[PDB]
Write a protein that binds this ligand. Structure first.
Ligand code: CLA
Ligand code: CLA
Ligand code: CLA
Ligand code: CLA
Ligand code: CLA
Ligand code: CLA
Ligand SMILES: CC(C)=CCC/C(C)=C\CC/C(C)=C\CC/C(C)=C\CC/C(C)=C\CC/C(C)=C\CC/C(C)=C\CC/C(C)=C\CC/C(C)=C\CC1=CC(=O)C(C)=C(C)C1=O
Ligand SMILES: CCCCCCCCCCCCCCCCCC(=O)OC[C@H](CO[C@@H]1O[C@H](CO)[C@H](O)[C@H](O)[C@H]1O)OC(=O)CCCCCCCCCCCCCCCCC
Ligand SMILES: CCCCCCCCCCCCCCCC(=O)OC[C@H](CO[C@@H]1O[C@H](CS(=O)(=O)O)[C@@H](O)[C@H](O)[C@H]1O)OC(=O)CCCCCCCCCCCCCCC
Ligand SMILES: CC1=CCCC(C)(C)[C@H]1/C=C/C(C)=C/C=C/C(C)=C/C=C/C=C(C)/C=C/C=C(C)/C=C/C1=C(C)CCCC1(C)C
Ligand SMILES: CC1=CCCC(C)(C)[C@H]1/C=C/C(C)=C/C=C/C(C)=C/C=C/C=C(C)/C=C/C=C(C)/C=C/C1=C(C)CCCC1(C)C
Ligand SMILES: [Cl-]
Ligand SMILES: [Fe+2]
Lengths: 31, 75, 34, 29, 503, 37, 342, 65, 37, 164, 39, 37
């Protein structure tokens, strides 16, 4: 049952990484 | 004045052809005299052990430490 | 008056000599297993 | 003399200890 | 806007709202005190104080109640072991309910101050802006602190109009709340003299009171006012964090090393009582003078109280737990039931061997039975082949003296080995490992947990003091540096650093 | 594996509470940015 | 300037080769007294009467095996003042009981205090924000937690890190064997901070040196920078594109980058300080109880954690006799935990 | 903005914000008492450290009884 | 007592959101194996 | 486990390449903290008090976001003028150089201890006039290495030397 | 007065007359001699 | 009394998740109202 928690936490970290890479705030130059 | 300006000056080297070797040799006679072993208490190569003292010396009390140190270091 | 390149040469030579004397003492006398 | 004091407080013990160490290389047990 | 870590800075220049947030924090802390007391009372077992005291049950906050008077419960029991017939209001339950009620009242006061913030009390009459006369406010607070300190020392601790404080003998066997007369003189500075507490709290309080009269009356010098930024409240925050981590380190030290303000029967023994054999020596001298009185080993060891033998046990050491071995000390080895007595180890001839005790450093220590002089005689070998000092070869028997296992002489090698393993851990006891489902790994007493938490808090608050001292002394350059920095920072531009009148 | 039982609550809630705090701080801020325009 | 305090303040804050400042009245003596003390203790003073070791160049040690060993265990946590009840004014006996370690450590604590005060003072006088004094808080925390609070939680100063190279290696392996400090999550956070800070240093250096603008016609591009220029010497946009399309994310803000470069090592040091403060009280993340119980009931259950526990037992048993001579541990070959063959 | 009875009572205690004595003021006696308190803290630290053994001051658990 | 002049908005940009979520999840990953025991 | 076995079999701590790697990582942390502290400390004022200082920098701007002169002068006063890197490009080259060279050296050290060229062995290097061994810190480290050596892979070795 | 108390008082006296007083006197003399200009 | 163990997680998280959802929906709306002005 702890394998459920470990897997969920690792998958959540991977999901945060995915969303940070692909749904980042796009860099743009100010004016 | 800048460091290189001092180092290349002749006066610097008239001073330090005599001053630096003097203390470089003073350290030599500091240890060659055996004076370090007496100031700092460091055993010489023939003082780690002695009769009835073929084991390591250790201080086992805080307050009588000087007393047992003389007792162990009577020599 | 003394060129600083010569000063650097002699000083580095002397420092390397001192360190090499330390290395020899490391292979000789007290501190060596022999 | 503060420059003298600093640089020589660093230097004099240094050369003294280096001479002692170069001598200590020859203790020879 | 205001990032997540600056959010509580809006209340920096709003004294009424500052009082509101302080009130809310105070309410939360008092509510925690009450709730922790209630939970502890829910899970506390007051039946057995000698082999299952408060510190074996993980009682963190209850000893602080018991330290300065509150030793009774509405349920008709006392931490001292006696049965209370007519408990007063100020029991553990009453203290908890009082703290909860104070939490609620402080919450309501916080609400009122949050809503009603624009009071003329907080506005400077000279300028009209919101302000706090911090040097005089400090004098008022120091008057209050001195009055409370003197009252605690003179009435509560001395018991003139109070319970007194917890006082105990040298070995934690007979301790109780009682008044302590103040110890004026050098003896008051002995950390293990409880009387020195009273002498402190009176005298210090008096000086604090006098200091208050100074600080209300005397304005600060202009030099210190500009140097310390006394008009900036963050100066007060930095200095307060400084004093707070100072106090935290001092309390951590007096907790770990012990003092009259940390009795062992309230927080367990220290590591140093185990290291120096503090209780082993006392038990040994007790049985020695019993033997000199004509008694035998059985009678002499039977006179040793179970509590004293319980202190002489490594499981009670605070230096044996672990960072993530969580829960009561009973969750580890178990709930102590009885004392099996002293296991004398009579070798094959009859010489008295003794098992060398486990030092706190070692998670696992070899079982070796040193001689009277201490040459190794017997041991439990790791490699049985070519074994010289096996108990089988030497031959050993365990004779028990005192305790429930008194007068029993086991002489088989297996049963000798089993009790050698127990004697490695100090005195040997029986444990219940089923009530709490104990897992056989030692835990730390409340002493060790207090020391851990407050050491870490003291270090972190040193960091906080650095941060806030830096902020109050560098307020003008908070957002960044201007163009003035480029001219002064040049090497040799000014004779004195910073000052520009120079050159 | 004889693991603890409140450790489930400890891990899950100590992950959940800060996570929802961060998500709320982000959503609040965005909402405010949208409302300004 | 007229007043005596103003004159002292003016002289102390003079812009010369070595800034003195008011903090210099605390830094320069103690720091000096620390460093020379080390150079004294590692050169002439022995550990024969405290540890049973040789620890000086005079006794025959080299730079690795020479150290200022901790005091004797019998000293407890004595301040080891030369005038105290232990040495009682005798310099030789003071050096022999390892009081020079107390000298070096207690003067080094105040030297660190004086240097952080120096950072604050120079930041104030120059007129910049005091972020360098707060980054030195990390090293201060390391020194305080490892050299002061750890021995103060243990039996004596004896178990502090002896000031040396081989001495520090012995401290590393001792702490691993007796506390299993690699398993400590706070140590893990600390090594994460250290290695991440080294990573940030390397990547930042490479990125800045490799997105430099062409400000010259020399193949060697160091001379093409002026200290006082009001133009960025490298492309933030090009570096952002590179790291965004190589690694998915990339810094877009220099100020955030440089605060991050500060925060990572400092956070690592403070985290590891929490772990060492835990280790002072033997509150150690030594074991996972679930696996210990399973291996106790299942003699075929093996993990690398259990192998590490066996290695720790080996370290403790084979190290205690010579590492703690005051305990007089005589472990026969029978009881020493061993393996087959070697 | 709001006037209250307790506010009026406590207003004199918060009416001298920014009032500073000119010059160094009481700093010399502040430093002297700082020296004295430093000496006191040193004395008690050395007492518990047992680097300063005072007669009739037995720093030990056994002193309790 | 009326509107407070010290009211300020609070923000958490998306980069900070991802940083916080990553920190919390990684702390959970690190300390879960120690809380369960 | 791999660390402890490597130390037991090779004495990596006394091997100078690992010491260079330790210097590399510690110096990388030191220079990272120092560089971040000095850049953050001399940030040019471009931000209001109710706003994060990081927003004073706009992505893609042409101007420098901090005063190099201020940081350089502060660090010169902190230690001495000659130590400071007045050139920024040389500074960043040094930042990229120190950890990269340190980690190169420690990787090469592990590569060489793969073929059993171990760290220094000063065990029993100090003997008295009679010739009996006076221990040093190297010997006490050797005791820990020996405990790890004997306890590692308890069932795998049938012969006294760990040649494999 | 125990030997430890005498040692403590002597340590305070020598701290004054060997560290504090010499450094203070040197600072005072040097600050009064080598003075900044246009303060 | 012997009770389930995941029921703790069930009750606590089924209370927590909707509660934080409602709190987020409120704060976000308010932030937007403040940003509009
Ligand atoms: C005759 C009257 C009288 C008497 C009998 C006492 C009695 C006492 N005072 Mg004293 N006191 C008095 C008047 C008196 N006081 C007055 C008038 C004042 C002025 C208000 C004080 C102010 C005062 C303070 C501020 C303190 C005492 C303390 C004590 C206790 C000393 C023993 C002890 O447990 O020390 C234990 C504590 C110490 C020996 C102090 C240690 C100090 C060092 C320097 C701290 C170092 C901290 C540092 C940050 C650590 C860094 C390194 C680390 C991280 C490794 C004792 C109860 C101490 C106390 O509360 O002890 C619990 C204490 O700290 N008193
Ligand atoms: C109304 C008064 C009141 C009373 C009678 C009590 C009574 C109690 N509280 Mg407390 N408590 C109160 C208010 C009160 N509380 C409030 C308002 C709060 C909210 C912050 C709390 C929060 C609280 C907690 C969190 C806890 C208690 C606990 C306790 C118990 C132990 C007290 C103790 O040992 O303190 C010891 C206190 C100290 C050692 C600190 C003393 C003061 C420092 C050293 C002063 C330093 C600064 C000073 C200005 C320096 C200069 C002064 C000098 C010149 C004179 C006891 C039942 C404990 C308990 O068991 O609860 C169930 C507990 O853990 N209380
Ligand atoms: C410094 C203050 C303090 C101290 C010294 C103690 C001491 C004690 N408490 Mg605790 N306790 C405290 C504050 C404190 N408490 C507070 C504020 C609360 C309210 C929440 C509680 C609530 C509480 C309860 C409910 C119980 C105790 C109990 C205990 C005992 C066991 C401690 C234990 O097992 O720790 C175990 C600690 C850990 C496993 C963690 C310690 C290491 C660090 C701090 C972890 C940090 C993790 C970090 C935040 C990252 C998390 C990431 C996340 C995403 C997962 C002990 C006497 C037990 C007892 O015996 O009661 C009768 C008990 O049942 N305490
Ligand atoms: C009583 C002491 C105290 C007080 C009154 C303050 C007050 C302040 N600090 Mg803090 N600070 C303290 C101690 C204190 N600090 C300590 C000990 C440290 C060292 C770690 C710091 C480090 C620090 C920094 C580095 C900064 C501040 C800042 C601030 C300001 C804004 C903080 C904010 O809005 O946080 C909002 C915080 C949150 C929204 C969530 C924080 C969650 C934490 C990390 C975990 C959970 C905590 C837990 C629930 C309770 C802790 C219990 C306690 C016993 C420790 C504010 C004036 C900021 C500042 O100066 O702004 C101008 C700032 O940047 N402080
Ligand atoms: C490295 C640690 C450190 C650092 C960098 C700072 C930095 C600062 N502190 Mg200090 N502070 C420290 C430790 C530190 N503090 C400690 C441990 C305490 C005691 C709790 C304080 C208490 C404190 C207060 C109360 C205040 C400051 C303030 C300040 C600021 C101004 C400078 C100052 O007052 O220096 C203080 C000077 C020193 C730290 C040097 C002390 C040197 C001592 C006297 C020598 C002792 C030698 C003696 C012989 C040793 C005997 C013991 C031995 C036997 C073991 C600044 C941000 C002020 C501030 O923030 O104003 C806005 C302020 O009000 N600090
Ligand atoms: C920056 C200056 C500085 C600082 C902060 C320290 C700090 C320290 N030194 Mg010292 N030391 C210094 C300079 C300094 N030293 C110098 C220049 C030397 C070379 C001569 C030494 C030589 C030295 C030695 C040989 C030793 C120390 C030691 C110590 C420690 C103990 C201090 C102590 O309790 O002394 C005693 C207290 C004081 C000096 C404070 C004096 C306070 C006032 C001025 C006294 C006023 C007198 C009073 C009115 C008398 C009335 C009588 C009575 C009723 C009170 C401490 C870490 C000891 C150590 O590290 O042990 C391991 C140690 O043995 N130091
Ligand atoms: C004793 C004692 C004080 C020893 C000091 C030893 C010593 C000379 C250390 C120098 C270390 C070193 C080479 C410094 C460069 C490290 C470096 C990358 C710092 C950051 C940095 C340096 C600058 O020089 C400027 C200018 C800026 C901006 C900046 O970040
Ligand atoms: C003040 C500035 C001084 C410069 C620092 C010098 C510190 C090294 C002293 C070396 C010493 O005295 O060795 C002195 C020893 C003396 O050599 C020993 O002498 C003994 C005499 O009995 C025996 O003969 C030993 O066998 C022999 O090894 O020299 C060495 O062993 C040779 C190696 C020297 C290498 C030193 C440079 C190492 C750099 C260390 C990095 C410092 C950390 C900086 C971090 C920032
Ligand atoms: C720029 C210029 C810098 C100049 C640097 C000069 C430094 C050297 C000064 C001292 C050299 C002494 C040579 C000597 O007699 O050998 C002494 C020993 C004895 O060897 C022993 O030699 C013995 C044979 S024999 O008698 O030497 O032939 C042999 O039996 C024995 O096994 C063996 O250990 O040989 C050494 O190990 C010396 C190593 C010194 C190396 C210098 C390192 C420099 C680093 C910087
Ligand atoms: C996360 C973390 C980090 C470090 C420490 C630790 C590991 C322990 C962990 C926990 C930390 C913290 C800070 C925990 C603290 C918990 C707190 C403060 C809990 C709060 C408890 C308060 C309670 C019930 C208050 C009860 C109040 C009530 C009914 C009031 C009711 C009332 C009101 C409102 C009006 C008047 C009438 C009445 C009935 C009195
Ligand atoms: C200790 C003590 C006790 C009580 C009172 C007292 C005030 C005396 C107090 C303080 C004493 C003090 C401060 C003494 C001072 C001693 C000092 C400063 C000693 C320092 C000596 C320095 C030494 C060797 C330096 C040696 C350097 C070496 C090899 C360098 C090696 C190198 C060389 C040779 C060439 C190139 C390569 C490289 C690596 C750079
Ligand atoms: Cl084999
Ligand atoms: Fe940069």
């Amino acid at each position: 049952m702890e394998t459920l928690v470990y897997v969920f936490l690792l998958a959540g970290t991977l999901g945060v990484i995915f969303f940070a890479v692909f749904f980042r705030d796009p860099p743009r130059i100010a004016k | 004045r800048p460091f290189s300006d001092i180092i290349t000056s002749i006066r610097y080297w008239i001073i330090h052809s005599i001053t630096i070797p003097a203390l470089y040799v003073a350290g030599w006679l500091f240890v060659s005299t055996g004076l370090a072993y007496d100031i700092f208490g460091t055993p010489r190569p023939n003082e780690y052990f002695t009769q009835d003292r073929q084991q390591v010396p250790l201080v086992n009390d805080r307050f009588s430490a000087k007393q047992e140190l003389e007792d162990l270091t009577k020599g | 008056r003394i060129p600083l390149w010569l000063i650097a040469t002699v000083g580095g030579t002397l420092a390397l000599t001192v360190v090499g004397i330390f290395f020899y003492g490391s292979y000789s006398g007290v501190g060596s297993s022999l | 003399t503060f420059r003298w004091l600093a640089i020589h407080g660093l230097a004099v013990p240094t050369v003294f200890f280096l001479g002692a160490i170069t001598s200590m290389q020859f203790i020879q047990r | 806007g205001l990032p997540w870590y600056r959010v509580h800075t809006v209340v920096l220049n709003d004294p009424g709202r500052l009082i509101a947030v302080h009130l809310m924090h105070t309410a939360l802390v008092a509510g925690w005190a009450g709730s922790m007391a209630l939970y502890e009372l829910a899970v506390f077992d007051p039946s057995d104080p000698v082999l299952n005291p408060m510190w074996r049950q993980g009682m963190f906050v209850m000893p602080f109640m018991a330290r300065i008077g509150v030793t009774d419960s509405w349920g008709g029991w006392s931490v001292t072991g006696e049965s209370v017939a007519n408990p007063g209001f100020w029991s553990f339950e009453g203290v908890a309910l009082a703290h909860i009620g104070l939490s609620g009242l402080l919450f309501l006061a916080a609400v009122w101050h949050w809503v009603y913030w624009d009071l003329e009390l907080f506005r400077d009459p000279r300028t009209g802006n919101p302000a706090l006369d911090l040097p005089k406010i400090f004098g008022i607070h120091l008057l209050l602190s001195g009055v409370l300190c003197f009252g605690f020392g003179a009435f509560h601790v001395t018991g003139a109009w109070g319970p007194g404080i917890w006082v105990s003998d040298a070995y934690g066997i007979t301790g109780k709340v009682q008044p302590v007369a103040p110890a004026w003189g050098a003896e008051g500075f002995n950390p293990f003299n409880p009387s020195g507490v009273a002498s402190h709290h009176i005298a210090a309080g008096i000086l604090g009171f006098l200091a208050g009269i100074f600080h209300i009356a005397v304005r600060p010098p202009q030099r210190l006012y500009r140097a310390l930024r006394m008009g900036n409240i963050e100066t007060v925050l930095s200095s307060s964090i400084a004093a707070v981590f100072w106090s935290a380190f001092i309390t951590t030290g007096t907790m770990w090393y012990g003092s009259a303000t940390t009795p062992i029967e309230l927080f367990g023994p220290t590591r140093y009582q185990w290291d120096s054999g503090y209780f082993q020596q006392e038990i040994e001298r007790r049985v020695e003078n019993s033997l000199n009185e004509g008694l035998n080993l059985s009678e002499a060891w039977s006179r040793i109280p179970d509590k004293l033998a319980f202190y002489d046990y490594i499981g009670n050491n605070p230096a044996k737990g672990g960072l993530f071995r969580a829960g009561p000390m009973n969750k580890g080895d178990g709930i102590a039931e009885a004392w099996l007595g002293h296991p004398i180890f009579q070798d094959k001839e009859g010489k008295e061997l003794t098992v060398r005790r486990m030092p706190a450093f070692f998670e696992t220590f070899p079982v070796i039975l040193v001689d009277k002089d201490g040459i190794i005689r017997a041991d439990i070998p790791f490699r049985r082949a070519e074994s010289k000092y096996s108990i089988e070869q030497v031959g050993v028997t365990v004779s028990f003296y005192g305790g429930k296992l008194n007068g029993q002489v086991f002489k088989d090698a297996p049963t000798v080995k089993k009790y050698a393993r127990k004697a490695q851990l100090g005195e040997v006891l029986e444990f219940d490992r089923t009530t709490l489902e104990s897992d056989g790994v030692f835990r730390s007493s409340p002493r060790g947990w207090y020391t851990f938490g407050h050491a870490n808090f003291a270090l972190l608050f040193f960091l906080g003091h650095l941060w806030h001292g830096s902020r109050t002394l560098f307020r003008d350059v908070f957002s960044g540096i201007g163009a003035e920095v480029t001219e002064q920072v040049e090497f040799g531009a000014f004779q004195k650093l910073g000052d520009r009148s120079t050159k | 594996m004889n693991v603890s039982v409140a450790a489930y609550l400890a891990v899950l809630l100590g992950t959940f509470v800060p996570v929802v705090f961060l998500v709320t701080l982000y959503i609040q801020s965005e909402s405010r940015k949208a409302g300004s325009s | 300037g007229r007043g005596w305090f103003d004159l002292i303040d003016d002289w102390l804050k003079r812009d010369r080769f070595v800034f003195v400042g008011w903090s210099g009245l605390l830094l320069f003596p103690t720091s000096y007294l620390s460093i020379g003390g080390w150079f004294t203790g590692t050169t002439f003073v022995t550990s024969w009467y405290t540890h049973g070791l040789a620890s000086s160049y005079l006794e025959g040690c080299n730079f690795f095996t020479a150290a200022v060993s901790t005091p004797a265990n019998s000293m407890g946590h004595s301040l080891l003042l030369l005038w105290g009840p232990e040495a009682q004014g005798d310099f030789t006996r003071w050096c022999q009981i390892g009081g020079l370690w107390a000298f070096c450590a207690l003067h080094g604590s105040f030297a660190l205090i004086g240097f952080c005060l120096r950072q604050f003072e120079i930041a104030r006088l120059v007129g910049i924000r005091p972020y360098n004094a707060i980054a030195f808080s990390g090293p201060i925390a390391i020194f305080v937690s490892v050299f002061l609070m750890y021995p103060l939680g243990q039996a004596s100063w004896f178990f502090a890190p002896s000031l040396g190279v081989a001495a520090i290696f012995r401290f590393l392996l001792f702490i691993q064997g007796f506390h299993n400090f690699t398993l400590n999550p706070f140590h893990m956070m600390g090594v994460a901070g250290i290695l991440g800070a080294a990573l940030l240093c390397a990547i930042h250096g490479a990125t800045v040196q490799n997105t430099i603008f062409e400000d010259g016609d020399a193949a060697n591009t160091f001379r093409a920078f002026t200290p006082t220029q009001a133009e960025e010497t490298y492309s933030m946009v090009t570096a952002n594109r590179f790291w965004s399309q190589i690694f998915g994310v990339a810094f877009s803000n220099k100020r955030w980058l440089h605060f991050f470069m500060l925060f990572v090592p400092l956070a690592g040091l403070w985290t590891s300080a929490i772990g060492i403060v835990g280790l002072a009280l033997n509150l150690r993340a030594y074991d996972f109880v679930s696996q210990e119980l399973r291996a106790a009931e299942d003699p075929e259950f093996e993990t690398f954690y259990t192998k590490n526990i066996l290695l720790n037992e080996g370290i403790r048993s084979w190290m205690a006799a010579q590492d703690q001579p005051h305990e007089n541990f005589i472990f026969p070959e029978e009881v020493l935990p061993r393996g087959n063959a070697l | 903005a709001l006037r209250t009875r307790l506010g009026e009572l406590l207003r004199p205690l918060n009416s001298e914000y920014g009032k500073v004595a000119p010059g160094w003021g009481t700093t010399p006696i502040m430093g002297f008492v700082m020296l004295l308190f430093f000496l006191f803290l040193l004395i008690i630290l050395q007492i518990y450290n047992s680097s300063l053994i005072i007669e009739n001051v037995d720093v030990d658990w056994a002193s309790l009884g | 007592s009326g509107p407070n002049p010290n009211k300020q908005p609070v923000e958490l940009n998306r980069t900070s959101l991802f940083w916080g979520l990553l920190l919390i999840f990684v702390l959970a990953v690190l300390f879960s194996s120690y809380f369960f025991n | 486990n791999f660390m402890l076995v490597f130390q037991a079999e090779h004495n990596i701590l006394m091997h100078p390449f690992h010491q260079l790697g330790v210097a590399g990582v510690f110096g990388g942390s030191l220079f990272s903290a120092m560089h971040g502290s000095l850049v953050t400390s001399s940030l040019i004022r471009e931000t209001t008090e109710n706003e994060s200082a990081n927003y004073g920098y706009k992505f893609g701007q042409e101007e420098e976001t901090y005063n190099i002169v201020a940081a350089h002068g502060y660090f010169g006063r902190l230690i001495f003028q000659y130590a400071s890197f007045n050139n920024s490009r040389a500074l960043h080259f040094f930042l990229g150089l120190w950890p990269v060279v340190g980690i190169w050296f420690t990787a090469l050290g592990v590569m060489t201890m793969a073929f059993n060229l171990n760290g220094f062995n000063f065990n029993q290097s100090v003997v008295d006039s009679q010739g009996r061994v006076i221990n040093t810190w190297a010997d006490i480290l050797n005791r820990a290495n020996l405990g790890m050596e004997v306890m590692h892979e308890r069932n795998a070795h049938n012969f006294p030397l760990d040649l494999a | 007065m125990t030997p430890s108390l005498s040692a403590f008082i002597n340590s305070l006296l020598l701290g004054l007359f060997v560290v504090v007083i010499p450094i203070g006197a040197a600072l005072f003399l040097v600050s009064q001699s080598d003075r900044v200009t246009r303060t």
